[PDB]
Ligand SMILES: O=P(O)(O)O[C@@H]1[C@@H](O)[C@H](O)[C@H](O)[C@H](O)[C@H]1OP(=O)(O)O
C-alpha cells in the first residue's frame with residue numbers, strides 16, 4: 111500500500127533513465143503475493159500517466175510493460191478486465207524539444223499496451239508466454255479457434271510495429287528501455303504467429319470452402335507483415351543487439367499457390 | 374576459401390554498424406564444417422586488423438568475439454594455440470574525431486580478446502560455457518585445481534572491466550555491438566567466478582594452512598571485483614538493457630571473518 115505506492119513513485123521519477131531494476135524487482139514480488147491488492151497497484155501507475163512531464167509518463171508505461179512481461183499473470187488479467195486503459199492519444203509535453211519528440215512515442219507505445227490487454231481479454235491467454243513447438247497451443251489448436259485467433263495476433267503485431275522508430279531516434283535511456291521490451295515481445299509474438307500459420311497450411315487443403323477463403327486472407331496479410339517485421343529487426347541490428355538473439359526469418363512464404371485451391 | 378574470404382570482407386566493411394547477422398551466421402557455419410581450414414579463416418580476420426580505419430578494425434574484433442561465443446570450439450582452440458594474437462596496443466586512427474575517440478576502445482577490447490584466448494589455453498575449457506549449478510565443473514572441482522583456476526577468472530574479468538565505458542560514450546552502432554557481447558561474457562563470467570567462491574567457502578575450514586592463506590587472498594580480491602561489476606551493470610541499466618537480463622548480485626560477501634580462522 112504505502113510501501114507499494116512509494117515504490118511506484120521511485121520507479122517513475124523525473125530522472126532520464128528507465129525504471130531501476132531494484133524498484134522493478136520489488137513490484138514483481140508484489141504481483142506474486144496473494145495479499146497485495148492488484149487494483150490499487152495498477153491505479154497508482156495510471157495516476158502517474160496524468161503527469162505533465164514526458165519522463166514520468168513514459169516511465170510509468172515502461173513499468174506497466176515490464177510487469178505484464180515478468181509479473182504474475184493476475185496483473186495482466188486485471189488490466190484486461192477493465193473497460194478503459196491508457197488515454198494518452200493527445201499527449202504533448204511542450205516544455206522542451208526532447209518533450210515534443212518523445213510525445214509521439216508515448217502515444218504509440220500506450221496504444222500497443224492497450225492492445226496487448228485487449229488481446230488477453232479476447233483469447234484468455236498471453237501469446238508471448240505459451241508453449242511453443244509441436245506440443246503447444248499455437249501448434250495444436252482446432253481449425254475454428256485458429257481462424258478466430260490468428261487475426262488477433264495480427265492486430266497486436268500491427269500496433270507493435272506502429273511504434274515505428276529509426277536507429278537515429280534511440281537517443282536516451284528512457285526510449286531505449288521501451289525499445290528493449292518491445293524487441294522481446296516482437297520475437298515471441300512472431301514465433302506464435304508463425305506457429306499458427308504452420309498449423310494453418312497443415313489443415314488448409316482438408317477444409318470447408320469459405321474457411322479456405324478466410325485462411326487465404328490470413329496467409330495473405332502474414333506475408334505483408336513478414337516484410338514489416340524484417341524492417342523492425344534491421345533497426346535492432348543497426349542499434350547493436352547481439353545477432354544471436356535475432357531470429358532467422360527463413361521460414362514459410364513460398365506457398366502462395368493455394369490461391370487456386372479454390373477451384 | 375574465396376567464399377570464406379569474401380564473407381570476412383563483407384562482415385568488415387567501412388559501414389558504421391556492427392557486422393551483419395547474415396554474414397555472421399555464414400561464418401558460424403564455417404566453423405562447424407570439418408573441411409574448412411580454421412587458420413586461413415582466422416588469418417583473414419587478423420589481416421583486417423592491420424587496416425588503418427577504426428571502423429574496419431573494430432568490426433574485425435567484434436566478428437572474432439562473436440565466433441568465440443557462437444562458433445564451434447575448434448575456433449577458440451586454434452586462437453589459444455597461437456603464440457601471438459592481436460597487437461593493437463598502439464592503434465590510433467587520426468582521420469577524424471570519431472577515430473580518435475574509438476581508438477582507445479579498440480586497444481582495450483583487443484586486450485580483452487587476447488586474455489580470453491590465454492585463459493582457454495591455461496585451463497583447457499571456456500569459463501563462459503561450462504555447466505553451472507551443483508552438478509557443474511566450477512561447483513565440483515578439487516581443492517588444488519580450484520586454487521589454481523579462480524585467479525585466471527579474476528584476470529579475465531579485470532581485462533573485461535578495463536573496457537571502462539560510460540553510457541554517454543555508447544554513441545554508434547559499432548561500439549554498441551561490442552558492448553552487447555561484452556555484457557553477455559560479463560554475466561556468464563561472474564556466474565562462474567561466484568560458483569568458484571561458493572566451492573571455496575565450502576572447503577575453506579577443512580584445508581591446509583598455506584592453502585587457507587591463498588583462499589583468503591582470493592576471497593579478498595573477489596569482494597573488490599564485486600563492486601566493479603556493480604558499476605558495470607549500472608552502465609547497462611542506464612543504457613536500457615532489459616532488467617530481467619541483469620543478474621541479482623545479492624550473493625556471498627557477508628563472511629570476511631575467516632580472516633581469523635588462521636589462528
Ligand atoms: O544505489 P541505489 O540503490 O541506486 O540507491 C540510491 C543511493 O545511491 C542514494 O543516492 C540515494 O539517495 C538515492 O535516492 C538512491 O536511489 P533510490 O532512492 O531510487 O533507491
Ligand SMILES: O=P(O)(O)O[C@@H]1[C@@H](O)[C@H](O)[C@H](O)[C@H](O)[C@H]1OP(=O)(O)O
Pocket residue numbers: 383393395
Ligand atoms: O538486404 P541485405 O541482405 O542487407 O543485402 C544488401 C542488399 O540490400 C543490396 O543493397 C546490396 O547491394 C548490398 O550490398 C547488400 O548487402 P551485402 O553485400 O552485405 O549482402
